[PDB]
Structures are given as C-alpha cells and as structure tokens.
Amino acid sequence: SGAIYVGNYRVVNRHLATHNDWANLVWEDSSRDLLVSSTTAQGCDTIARCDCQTGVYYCSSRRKHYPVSFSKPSLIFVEASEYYPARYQSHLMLAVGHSEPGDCGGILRCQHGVVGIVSTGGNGLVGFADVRDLLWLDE
Numbered sequence: 352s353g354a355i356y357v358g359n360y361r362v363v364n365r366h367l368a369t370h371n372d373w374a375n376l377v378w379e380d381s382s383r384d385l386l387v388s389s390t391t392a393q394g395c396d397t398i399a400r401c402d403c404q405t406g407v408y409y410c411s412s413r414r415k416h417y418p419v420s421f422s423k424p425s426l427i428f429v430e431a432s433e434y435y436p437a438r439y440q441s442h443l444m445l446a447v448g449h450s451e452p453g454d455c456g457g458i459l460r461c462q463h464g465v466v467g468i469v470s471t472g473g474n475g476l477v478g479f480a481d482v483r484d485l486l487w488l489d490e
C-alpha cells in the first residue's frame with residue numbers, strides 16, 4: 352500500500368483504489384495501473400520533472416529504502432492477475448531489486464522529487480509506474 356499527495360490530488364495504484372477514490376475520481380488509466388482522486392487537505396509531495404535513471408525506493412516487505420538503477424518508461428508485459436488479464440502495461444520502469452505483493456504503493460524518488468510508485472515485481476525485479484509526465488498534478 353501507499354499514495355502520493357500533491358496539491359489537491361491523491362495518486363494511488365488503480366487496483367488498490369478505495370470507494371472514496373472512485374467517488375472523487377479525477378483520472379484513471381488501466382494500462383498504467385494509475386488512479387488519481389481529489390482531496391480536501393493540501394498535500395506537500397514534490398513531483399520530479401526529469402529523465403533520472405537512478406533513485407531510491409521504499410520496500411515495505413523489508414521496512415528499508417533501497418538505491419536502484421531503473422529503465423526509461425515503456426510498454427512492458429505483465430502476467431495475468433485477479434485485477435487485470437495478461438497485457439502490456441505502459442509508462443512502466445524496471446529495476447533489479449526486492450519486491451513482493453504488498454509492496455505496491457511504495458514511492459520511488461530522485462534528488463528532484465517523486466518519480467513513481469511500485470506497481471509490479473517478482474523474479475528478483477521491481478516495476479514502477481512513472482508519474483513524471485503528469486504535468487497537471489502541479490496545477
């Protein structure tokens with residue numbers, strides 16, 4: 352679990368969105384596993400606007416942060432699950448590192464700010480849903 356709070360927006364994994372998230376929906380994209388809902392209290396996370404390929408992510412299954420090198424956002428195959436059938440997930444970034452079901456929502460950060468959130472894993476790899484392209488999150 353985990354969310355990004357920027358301005359009057361809450362950014363979560365689409366498969367983990369709550370009833371409240373859907374009742375205050377701003378935008379959702381099943382192919383990115385992203386959902387953005389509106390909030391009443393102001394958020395103070397800063398979003399990175401860059402093409403950084405190194406950063407640090409929070410892994411809740413180890414209660415630790417890990418430094419990672421990660422690939423550029425692209426179309427990557429994701430196995431079938433209880434939430435989605437087998438498909439290519441867009442805007443996805445891979446890194447070598449520990450992740451297990453329950454780690455989705457952990458933030459990935461660089462010196463510029465929030466890069467994305469954990470969305471996929473397994474095979475000794477971790478996948479991150481990029482948020483850097485969502486320029487409207489700051490307006």
Ligand SMILES: C[C@H](C(=O)N1CCC[C@H](C(N)=O)C1)c1cncc(F)c1
Nearest residue numbers: 384432450451452455470471472473
């Ligand atoms: C099996 C699961 C996963 O990758 N899912 C299921 C939940 C939806 C994900 C998606 N379609 O974007 C794919 C998982 C395994 N290891 C680490 C994780 F953070 C998650």
Ligand SMILES: [Zn+2]
Nearest residue numbers: 401403461463
């Ligand atoms: Zn950066």
